[model samples]
Target chain A: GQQYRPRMAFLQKIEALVKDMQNPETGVRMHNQRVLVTSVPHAMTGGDVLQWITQRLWISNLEAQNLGNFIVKYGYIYPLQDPKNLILKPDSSLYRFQTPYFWPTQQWPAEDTDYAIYLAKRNIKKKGILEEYEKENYDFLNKKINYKWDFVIMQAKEQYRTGKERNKADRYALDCQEKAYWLVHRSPPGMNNVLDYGLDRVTNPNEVKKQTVTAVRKEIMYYQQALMRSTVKSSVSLGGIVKYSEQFSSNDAIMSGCLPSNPWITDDTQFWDLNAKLVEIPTKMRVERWAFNFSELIRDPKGRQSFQYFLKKEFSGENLGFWEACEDLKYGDQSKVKEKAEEIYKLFLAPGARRWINIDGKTMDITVKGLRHPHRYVLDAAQTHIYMLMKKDSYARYLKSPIYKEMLAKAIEPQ
Target chain B: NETLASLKSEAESLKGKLEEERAKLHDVELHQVAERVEALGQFVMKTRRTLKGHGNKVLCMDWCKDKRRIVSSSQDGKVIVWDSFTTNKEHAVTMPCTWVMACAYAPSGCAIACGGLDNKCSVYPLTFDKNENMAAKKKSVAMHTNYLSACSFTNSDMQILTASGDGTCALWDVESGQLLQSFHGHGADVLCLDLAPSETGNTFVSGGCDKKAMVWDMRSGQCVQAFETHESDVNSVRYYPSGDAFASGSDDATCRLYDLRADREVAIYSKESIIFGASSVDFSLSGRLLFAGYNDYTINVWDVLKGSRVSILFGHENRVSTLRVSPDGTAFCSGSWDHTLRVWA
Candidate 1:
């Protein structure tokens, strides 16, 4: 009874296109290979229709012609059509066109295989099958419907099987042997050679205890004889000389002379009493007052020492040392003034010497010439230059330091 | 038949593909050379000018908005205003505090605001005669419970903002000596604050030891937004000329720019070459350059758009404490713990 119904010629045409366009070598069907159209509105020109279609499909038209109130053309075709194809939408009325037969009722699938299987399944059900098993067989025949991910799953399963087989293998024996090979062939055997040859030279210890002991004694005697023979071949001889203990060269004499003549008091009671007396000596004046007066500071030994302590903190103790040496020059031995002056100049004022003062060029020349006669006034200019350097540079920073601040606080504390 | 014509077609296709690849390489090399030329044209060299006047470690400095004068505070309790041209102190005012931590010269340059461990903000008028009464020596606003860390005059010069170690920043009416408003969201010491450069004068940004930088609106007395990107305490904050973006320097050795309109970080200026924390930051007049002081005793200058270091100026023997670009955009000044200030160009 259903055979009397009109047939869908458009379906046959689509099936023919799919079968004809497959690549012979790969067997994979390719789309966008040919153009076929069914119906078109009579009012639209071929140019207008193409403009409408190409805008949505991004496909170029190959030809445009008319046939009896309809337009036919060749252009890029797809499994169904471009996802954005406007003619598929009933509301896209920028220009009217006939809805082609067998046009997708819903949206197109993302993959070409999915779209092809979708149409094939619908066609199989439309064409009556003799039995239900035949319909099932048709689904199996089309790989896209029944085995969409067969290739991926099979490859993953094969990889897992091989991985499991490898995990079951015994790794300890293989790795240990490989390491043993590297050790024997790649590393040097100097120590092993000695142990192997030297230990084997001795007889095995399987004899009776007394007999083994006697044999060991005889072996030692033989070794002693061989060692003495090797030593006799050398040309060295003691002659009449005898060995003596080593002697140590030391600076103890020089250090002892520099030490104070009186031995330090070591009795605990006497030392504590002396320390208390030293503590009882009161600070003469506030340390802050001397920060501005270098003349006052250098007059007293304690004050000069405190100033030197501050100078040492600032890494400029040479300034204070040079100033002290100049004071010594004024009262130094009168007859040996030349020698002492030469010593002071060479030690402190000479260029490129330790504790050298940065003196002006003119002052340096005057001091150099004055050293020929060597007197008390010889270092006066250089001493003045160094005192001013300390006063201007280190003195100001010292006053602002925490040390001076603490000293000032203690000086003004309640008695 | 498959060897002659077929092989010839294959060879032709391979030659076409090679030609396409060579063309692509040529284009890439040409583009790289253009980039090199553009970078070379924008580079600028800088020099450091050492300014020595403060008797103690200089703690803070600000350039006058209209002239070549700079006001610096030091640990010797002295605020020294200097004529940058002669590198000499013009006005030296000794405050009562033993350690002054912050100082600012008003936009008009007629008055200077300073604060320190005395927990007081004092404004001294430069025109005051030396013979003035001792009772009215300066305008003193004292209420903060901790040391005052930073202070700045509003654009109108009618109010002053003070940031303190008490975890609060307060706005005070300059003439009345009364607290107008106080912003208090910081969990720790508020280290620095800067007012917006726009005419409204109603917004400001503050950075604190909690490692957070916050923007506040004076009208609502509420924090508008806050950012917590620094891994260490934020040491300083400064506004660009446009007020559309602001920068915060941190002890994490980074400077970050926050865009007000976008409400997010737009750029970060950092370099592995810098091995010390950033102590202070200031922007150029055109907002295209950023000058930052570091704890390594150096000033780092950055080209903002290029995100590359323009140059580094090295002169201070101790950590750089503060820096500010002059309003005229001619030069900038940096104060250091070496007890010296340097003006750089």
Candidate 2:
């Protein structure tokens, strides 16, 4: 059949397959690329894991006919060039990380192969065709790790949700840490990371129209830091009171349990699985999606198309390569390709993307962050509960603002 | 029942007392303001000629190094050179530019530095003859990546400093028009920069969108002091004439005077609406009169010696964008979006 297969079972021979990559190991894992099922029902049903596999398995609705097979979106599929680590195999690999994968979904597009190809092509040092082929190798291995892989695995989880009173403070601390980590990690090192857009630009009518890309980035930084500080601080404080209520009996569990389990305890599976399902309900989905959506880069791509599959395919040919993704894919041609690659890369990565909407016509992103936790969910539901006991307080604070409303409307609208 | 009635009467008495306290507080506030006004002396402003001749709003204006002329940057992208000495005579020259936002005369008075909204700043030689006329001769410095916000000469008068919406403050050598040192800070636009006349002109300060006022050592390009002042954006910052103090205006509608000797705000003045951070503020040659261009289409002349407003110039119909006092101290020029430049005496 000429089909490529590792000499062992899917889960059985991981170590061996990686060891003998000279023979074209069938699956190379990426960070957060694997389907994590908390419960049998969740594993089997339409939660993130199921959805992740199913979305790829079945042909997209736009396809001529439903192929009815699970789609493997993790990697590229360049038949001619089978780069090694470049393929986005659902298995774990050192190249992939949760936050990076989710970044594009938040701000930019997820499936931009051109950007992928451009980034991978950075590794190509040869001239002309050989350079082109080498770039394809870079793509399959390096670019694949960089693409929208986080969106697939970290879907339906809030880095901030703490469903329990006990978990509230701890989870919030982690949320702030996560945001800080992303801030430092996503930003370019040193002074280049900072920008100043002064007052004269805004007030001076002549100058206002003369804004540049750096000005926009500065604006985003101002807004981003404010949003992170306020959201993290407010949520942490509010979560304290909310988790103690009878209404939050369930909410407390969700907040404490969402993904990337806290290491304070021996195992986080108990809390992680419990909240993943409860938070997935349509009403709560909005909140979860908000947390998920913000994790990507947002903007139009400036240049090239570099795909991961292309890299793996190119590098797969011989024993010439010494690593399972060289510990940091700093391609020698990186400078030449840097500008074009970054320009094209933006299109594929979505940060602060318009969150998808649910049937209720709500901005799913807001509801996800606002309601994913058990306490938030209960508080939200109780506002509408017909019981006289639940009707005493105001729900105005929980209501979404115009910006959020617009985001929700756009996300949920028929596109 | 008796206890409840007693409690109700007490509550009624407390409400009555609260109303009385509110009125008393209001009266006290008014009284305090009056006392403060009485304690501070009044300001004296000198009136000068109103130079006109621009088709659009004026964005910025600066005093010439010679103190005899004033240059205005306009929304029309024209640098209008005016003789502040002329009153009803109205002799003004316009140098057409792409998107002029700021302009300043060079130390030699032979050239004028101009920055534009087109992401470029340049030095144009003053081609006027011995009698002073618009030569219309222009020379361009290279383009920056962002719109120009501020341009001025260093204490040395040889090197020019410029700030941009692109988040950078750069020092350029006037002769070669080459960028020497580029200072970066602020998360937003780099709005304003005032060179501290500390004898050497080795240091200056900048304020911008990040709601911060940063002091930089020009030679080192190092930010020495970062004042997280101003709740909103800081629009303009100026060094005191003698270099012992500085002033900062912000969108927060307040202009704060900082004493360099003390490194603190000595006083603050507030205005109605967003001040647009007082587009331009300058001290007269004697350092006694302070003129401030405000967002409310007014230029306020303050008697710094008296610490009170002497007169409020209310000719401009739009937000007054910039204010500059002539070197002779006989006149000052204000530019506004209303497309008019007024020379005040």
Candidate 3:
């Protein structure tokens, strides 16, 4: 017969279980739906046992299709008693539930109706016209096979529309709306109002004005020295980062309202023209939103007010802060290490980091927070968040030298 | 409540016992009464200010024959036009026409007319010669009347039609300042008058505080249609541009647009939201926008086709007495009790 045979290796395990279960006198009853059965075939065992299991035991499906011809040629085996009943019923509790059912056997027919016809053909070839001849032998065999049993227990699981147990589907969730890209602060705590208080009200508009005006004014006050430095540095540094290409020329670049129109380029001419060419920055990555409203280098001590405003705008509708980060930069609070780490992880890592975790498990992406690095390599989120702060710190420290301070003081104050 | 009432009655019966009880309940009951009085005081003040606002009671509103602006008028003797598109602080204008009660523009940018309280009507040509500064200003002509209450430009742009307190409706050539005809019928001051679209052939409607609205043919000087659209005096009326219809708002606080061809009211709107009846109404120059000024300080802009409020132009501290869409239909001007005109775009 060209039917099929179980693999020699898996057959050994099956034989061992069957021998112990079939010990007639002391064998336990099968656990019905709870009965566990697996066919641990060797990597090269082929499909022999898989096909054999399909023909005998009624396991619903065998996932060894990846084994391809190995399983198909040798035939596999499964644990089920009536494989034909494995066909899906329209309104059955298992309806449309793509359950993970692999007994190293049972193959579903492409056309499901073929199951009954094949079974009927098998019955006619062996069982002698339905009943008469096999009556005596069936009675003897019924007493021979034994069922298996297992310990009973109860557990909780999400209720699917189907009666079968399953986890709720939320495999992919993220809060990456374009709005999240510009917002810096996470959603506020315990608020149902659509507009958060920080965003809706101007908490310190006058202070912000004073600070920005000061920084801008200072930048001009030291322009002469800055101009000399630009000439000397340009001659030396040339095209390197050391030269202040952002300030290209002297008088022309300076605010000369009365300068001759011809042969004169306004100071407002873009600095990028003088620097080495690079791809245009992405709208989200450019931090243009924060640049126009510089919260990082502003009037308040530690720039808290400015930072809060920028964050409130950038992370609109989410509660995110430095304290929430894994390293717990005492800038905010003293939550547990895990909570802090997770929050920090999320500012750079977790997709469902905000209270949206309660609504739907989704977190804003790091790129959306303007934390994407120029390189393609993906760094851990907590590391990235810390790195951003470190980078800003470095820049600030570099500007602390007298030469840089002179440049910085010329910036506007309350202008 | 019954226990309290019984206690109150018992207190009246026993003065000494009542005195003891009153002291005990005063903290609770008095506090409640004080809160209610405070709330009521807030509400009353809000209502009183709201009532005294608005420059004029709005009478009627129609979309501009053009679409870019809205026109309105009021009983307070003013006509203010507004621009249709602007929403900022600058788009406002008021024409302090102490005698003007109603006004409208010609279908095209040719003429504008206003009926005055001084027994006279003023007609202004919409076309203008530019000054050295390149600004175009209106040229005016006057038509005498016994306190004209409503005015409209003929769709043909040739004549100005007016309703007067003298119980007569008159039409005059706007450019030549010549009297065309007078249709006498209303027994009292005509409160509002409107010309039908040119498709209706020189016929128009006049509504009066005498509780009657009459339609007349300018060519025949005969009353062709009459309807009592409201129980009280009808203060304003206007005809839609293409349809054989008209609308009038009245002291009854109801604004109704009637279809003369169908012999029925096509649309009826309430002016009850305002402090009084609508004082004036004008269709935008494009006829797609409706301006309804009211005794309340607010004038509502309505989509002509949808018959729903498109926007409300606030800032008039008093009743919007009059409104008029500009001749070119780019903007409209509104006059208010604040003695300022809002020019809205």
Candidate 4:
């Protein structure tokens, strides 16, 4: 015979609890709190609510405040003094118990007809004035429920007429109840209304794609560097470590204002626009980084492109081509590695090759002999030779070349 | 089967060779070198600012290159960009899914990237204006098979990287969403990731629930190196300032430093009193300090020079979920389950 949900049944328990709160002898002291013009009936101060909740729930003061906030967030209790804030403050501020009919646990449909009727009654009584959210809603309801507009307005006018026909102070109290109802049911925007429910993550989430096969390689130079590198030297002092900070401290944004004007602080977005991810003209700071080391020059996208153009003019672009080919051979598809090895042997490593790279005979012998039984990095020595060839022969010259100088001169300095 | 056998055979061969190399380089210890130096002068670092806006726990955060602005994602499905100097939120975005596990500011400072249960990383372009409903302006970058655990932009904003629960990591183009390079090694979900400090260094590191920390090459998409001595899942990995070493925070209740040059775990920062697993680890300006957040409501700041805990930060009421030093080692930010992100110098 009980036609209600478990959640709704739970709400009955809370209703019974609030009913106990209104008990005459041992409950919260509730009375008519005065507004500026008239008195709001059955209103209670937020101070006593936290006071009674702490005793009834037997929770700590912090826990009681958390509970108090929950009731306001969930719309079981509504704020009278500060309705839009939707949080409970354990001070002498005014609050009221929301009607049990509008409680979220009741699983109301929140139908448009009821909301439209309330707003229409509001418009009939107060004339054309409404709130920001209410004004937007009235126009939407007029267009959406325009077919039943007459029926909606009829209820509004009749209700507004009969409401005025009733007494003054008590009617003011009823209007407050209705006002609290809509605020909880149809909350204003930006109120953080947590009406939706039941969402938490798994203990350890069940992962989806387990079978997509991909490749994971290393060459000998990195292996030797890892195994053969030195320890932090003996007799090192704070000066050694402090020097590291001194070198890089200029880059720390907080310690120093590295930028002319921070976009986070001011209106200028010059820093963001000055050095975007892709830039036509490189920054002076970025080009200066290329001068620090050969790896810096080759690793940068813009710097590498500038070097590639420099090599094109020098008619020795074959060195970079050969180095890049070996890189692909080392990192490319493992299954197609032998074919790529054969292709590289023909393109640049073969004798009298069209794009012949000048490599030492020792590296060539190693590469040519390994071509019969090719593995991941059979052309390592040859690539190393060409890498050194480019770094010293072309890179050092490019640093002094007019090509590098012009880009340095043209590099955009931050405004 | 063939590749697996080869990997095992090489592993056995390298185990003995690594021991021999370790003995050859045992000339001086890092702790011995620090005996000549004085202990660090202790200073109290008070919380300079507290960023409060997220309705739930903040899961991840990254500082913009300018260093003043910070982007943080929350379990509340919101990402907020904060001007920490003034303690004001500059931009707030509501994602379509909750538990936004990762958020990073682009080096260009013009955009932000984030992902979580959506399994997709999206870049939202930001501007100073009264804009509303930015979900329309979203330029989705990439998606993973499982949830994305971490995301970071490469040197260029046009490219981005992500470590995901699919047990792999990848690089992708921003606007086109085309996959560029993919790294495969971890046998379990990747929990965290980091890029090297050097502009010339073409590598990144990722740690996984499989207890492995693997360094990957950006161009080759190969596992160039690996360190696996942890007894439990490795939660976070970070590069040392010198770029020749790295650190790992683990569920094994330790934060271990791995010398990339030495190819071994060089030092361990642990204590008997603290049984909680470390959640994140980072190096200070001179690579002298290793700061780690733990499952316990505290942070242990270790002196990497002498291999001991120096400062213990106790501020967050709940677990510090994510922690990182500022880009210049000036200050660090800790996003915690206590629904607050605090900054300390």
Clashing pairs in 1: none
Candidate 1 — number of clashing residue pairs? 0
TM-score for each candidate, following the candidate numbering:
0.40, 0.40, 0.32, 0.54
Per-prediction DockQ: 0.01, 0.02, 0.01, 0.09
**Ranking 2 against 3 by DockQ, winner:** 2
lDDT of 4: 0.74
Which candidate has the top score in DockQ? Answer: 4
Q: Write the per-residue lDDT of candidate 2 for residues A1-415, one digit (tens) a residue.
A: 1111111111122222223221323222212314442211111111222233234333233220111111111111111112221223322212212222322221123334433333323222123432344445444544456555344224312211221333444443333323222222233233111111112243332223543555444434433332232111222322221222222222222122222332122233333333232232222323323322111000001000011122234342111121111101111122222343332222211243232111122322332343333221212221122111111221121123343343345432110
Stretches off by above 4 angstroms in model 2 are A1-415, B1-47, B87-97, B129-137, B155-157, B271-277, B303-310
Error of 4 at A111 (Å): 40
State the lDDT of candidate 4 residue by residue for B22-136, as single tens digits.
6565455566656654456655565778998889888999988765689999988999999876778889899999889888888779999999889889999888778655677
Model 4 error, position B38 (Å) = 4.7
What DockQ results for candidate 4? 0.09
Candidate 1 segments whose C-alpha is farther than 4 A from its true place: A1-415, B1-49, B128-136
Query: If the candidates were sorted by their lDDT against the true structure, best first, what order would they fall in?
Result: 4, 1, 2, 3
Q: What's the candidate order when arranged by decreasing TM-score? A: 4, 1, 2, 3
lDDT of 3 at A407: 32
Q: Say what the interface RMSD of candidate 1 is.
A: 47.0
lDDT tens digits by residue: candidate 3, B96-169? 44435556656554445555545565554543343211112333434544565666665346556777666688
Query: How high is the CA lDDT of each candidate model?
Result: 0.56, 0.45, 0.39, 0.74
